[PDB]
Amino acid sequence: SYNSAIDQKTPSIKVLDNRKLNVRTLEYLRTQADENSDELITFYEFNIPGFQVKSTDPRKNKNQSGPNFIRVFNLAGQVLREESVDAGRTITLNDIESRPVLIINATGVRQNHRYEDNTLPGRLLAITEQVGEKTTERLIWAGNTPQEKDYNLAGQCVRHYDTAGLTQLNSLSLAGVVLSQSQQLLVDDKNADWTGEDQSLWQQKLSSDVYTTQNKADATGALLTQTDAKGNIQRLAYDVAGQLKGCWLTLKGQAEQVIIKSLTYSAAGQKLREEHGNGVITEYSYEPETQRLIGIATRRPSDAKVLQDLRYQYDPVGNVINIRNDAEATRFWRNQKVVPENSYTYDSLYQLISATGREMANIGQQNNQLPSPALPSDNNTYTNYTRSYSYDHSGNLTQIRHSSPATQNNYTVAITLSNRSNRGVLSTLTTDPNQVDTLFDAGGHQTSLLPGQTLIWTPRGELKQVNNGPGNEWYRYDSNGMRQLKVSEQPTQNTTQQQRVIYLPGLELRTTQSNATTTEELHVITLGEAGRAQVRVLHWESGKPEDVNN
């Protein structure tokens, strides 16, 4: 059910200059089959030494506004200034060894990197984010003491103080896999300011809880087993091709159960058949010719029940155009047992123009919230919807037209974009295209999520706080920018109501506390990669609900 009249005589042309540099790229856009294709020309300008100075998307070339990027290079070809129309202006200076020395982002935040002196190998020591002067990172390197060589710690960063606390490294394998590390978190009333020389006045900014995690690895460096920060051990087994074939979890004080008892693979190493310690067997089917996933069949071999069976269909290019479920509807939807077919169509640029599927009946209009669950008692159904999407020539989604018959909830929702930027907010915030860039930072981070919600950002452009009306929610990130903390502070009932999540390797320490006491403490044990059929274990140390089992 693919119509190839969308893609006739729409190739992609890269136009070259007399130096064979790509100065124009040409696209042809046909949204529906009968009409003519529209030529979109993206412009790339180069200077005389041959670097890409300015680039212009096809929508701002029609507006006669400026380019998207205006870059200034040095004589070697590295960017010294980058005035992006979406991300602001970045001033970057590197030294002789191409290491960063001075970075000024678009909010005016000067970042420093001081290194070791000329008698040392010149490794990174500290990072200073001046706004008024914070030594925000501090790296402690190791020596070649025979105590350090026993744990393979020689020439590593043993203590790494960052924007969220401390990450201490304890042991390395003979391959270089970390076998033991520990990490403390900064307290809530303190930010990372690691000034000085002594480290004894840096532990009074850290939490008392030191969360150490341990691993064991084989000679190939693949992780065999992993102890979490609480003592729950995951253990993996590998087959003769080096792939993963099994998984076992033993909680602290308990025996060893089975999480994955079999996992076979195809010839290309894709997953083929997997039986869990649940007992449920999932089975992946693939195209012979293209090796694309054309089936996910989740079967429970105790009731001969197929829980889901998703058969995918594709374009010649690999766009999903048809998902049908050959399973029956679950126990939550009474009086119906057929799952509708999801059909998708695309433009000539392969962007989604239409989409059908199933949705609940009491959902209403889509917003930031998720709807109430369909319990097995309230005998509610699902209905059919179809959404149609519209885009401009910059590729921004401008309009979602949700049309659901048999319920009469037909709504459109528009995204109001700028003329100079790709910065565009929802139409509830602003209907004017000229007051959209007032809702963003100078770096292009959005500053207001909804009409009554504001967002606060770090010096390095990470979400520091989502201010709601009465109750904020703030986060913390490490030096890589990965989230290590999420503290949701609900408003005053008689006191604050605080929910804290700590993100550890293979462990989430979700805890809820009032003024003086913890009212809930939950240790979520995760097994595997999220999106790769992850298994979670909810273990309650304190404040378990009545009806659920531990």
């Binding site: 792939q243 993963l244 992946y284 890589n480 293979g506 990669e529």
Partner: peptide, 16 residues
């Protein structure tokens, strides 16, 4: 970056 479906990649239980 926008990549394809998750089935294409190798398994990964522990990284940073």
């Amino acid at each position: 970056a926008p990549e394809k479906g998750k089935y294409t990649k190798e398994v990964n239980f522990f990284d940073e």
